[PDB]
Amino acid sequence: DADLRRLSLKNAKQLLRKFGVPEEEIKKLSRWEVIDVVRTMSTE
DNA sequence: GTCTGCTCGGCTCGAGTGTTCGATCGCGACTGAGGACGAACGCGCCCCCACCCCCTTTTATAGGCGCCCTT
Structure with a gap:
């Protein structure tokens, strides 16, 4: 984290982009939301 | 005198309320990262400070050069 x-x-x-997260979440590009989503994906 | 019914008391079970503990959410604080501003260093441009050429005077010396106009 x-x-x-x-x-x-x-x-x-x-x-x-590398993990295959859909382009909407990449598109909003909120930093805190982005880092929470990438932490969740690295947990998945 | 005996039997039976009724009433009262005691015990047990169930339900409700209160308290305690655990979990979740929110807020605050701290740390890290990014951006902006300031300072320092380097590079480029401009101004100056460089130059050996010119110089008028003197003197000795002398060949090439004029010129000098009178016969």
Whole structure:
């Protein structure tokens, strides 16, 4: 979660693209929501 | 005198209320990351400070050069 917050939005966007997260969540690009979704996907 | 019925008391069970504990949510604080501003360093441009050429005078010396106009 510390390194996930240290992802600095842009690389988290590329990671969400890599996992196969749908483009709506990538599109809103809220940082906190993005990092919560990528933490959830790394839990999944 | 005996038997039977009725009433009262005691015990047990069930329900309700209260208290305690656990879980979830919200708020606050701390840490990390990003952005902006300031300072320092480097590079480029401009201004200055560089130059050895010119210089008028003197003197000795002398060939090439004029010119000098009178016969």
